Amino acid sequence: QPVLHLVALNTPLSGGMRGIRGADFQCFQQARAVGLSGTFRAFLSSRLQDLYSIVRRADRGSVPIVNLKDEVLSPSWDSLFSGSQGQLQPGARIFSFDGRDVLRHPAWPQKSVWHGSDPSGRRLMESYCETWRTETTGATGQASSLLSGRLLEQKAASCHNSYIVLCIENSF
Template sequence: IHLIAANHPLSGDMDGISGADSICYKESKKFGWPNTFKAFLSSRWQDLRGLIKQGKNDYVTVLNGKNETLFDSLEDIFNGSEGKLVHKNFIYSFDGRDVLNDVVWPYKYVWHGSDKYGYQKPENETCKYWSSSDPDKYAMVGNLSRKRILSADKLSCWQRFALLCLEISQNNGVLLGKK
């Protein structure tokens, strides 16, 4: 499965989780990805690790937009290592830009709203469940400069960071995500 960034940084106000999912869906379709993508965010109703059905999918390889390995398995994201990127490959946006090295993303963070195991944090650590850009509200973000997509940095919702999108279906139509 693929983990790809939206094409521009966003504040914590993404019109909720459905708005963030819509961004991922629209950008994936615009750039010709045939499968379904959802926002790689925790919310009131979902943990990050719940985006994909547990079990046999734990060992599916996670690729970037250029089909290079980011994680040997989904479990490598949620094993408590803060989603440490151990491969030398980068996270790309749907339009092919390297998030870590492109000036479009001046701050090298990704929104997630989870702890290092992919479990949701409370409302006050998810920009009011992704519906606030209030400078006094906060969310958990991952630090790409440290190569950790689930690090426990807590930053203000008014800032603009990368939104990651996770592919949740396969070409054969098998749905990986929870219904």
């Protein structure tokens, strides 16, 4: 049964992530540290990339999305970008690579997730912290409150905030 893992980085990050190459490298390093074999990319839109396109086309329609512990979060990647704003089922849990529940652990003081995307997973050039290069208070990035059970809520948040960053396995 194919599945794609959605896992959080071990620490929150502000909008200044050294760009998408920086965020992607963190996903690579942290997955490798725990023995995960798949290819993990940061769950973020950037200048040249829409979040929606990060998962291989063949795995977008019918491969369930699961957390680190293989608990099912969504029936497919496409389901998240239907316009529901990435609604997860109640009680859904998201774990970091080292096994901590991001909602129950104090290491993530703010339960919001950076994404820089609209509800269909397309890039928001005016709201992605200058492609994740700045943490200045005046700049914004599109983020979502995990407390509301959604991954793609449309909140423009100051880039100076330290939020949860997710990594998605790009293919089974």
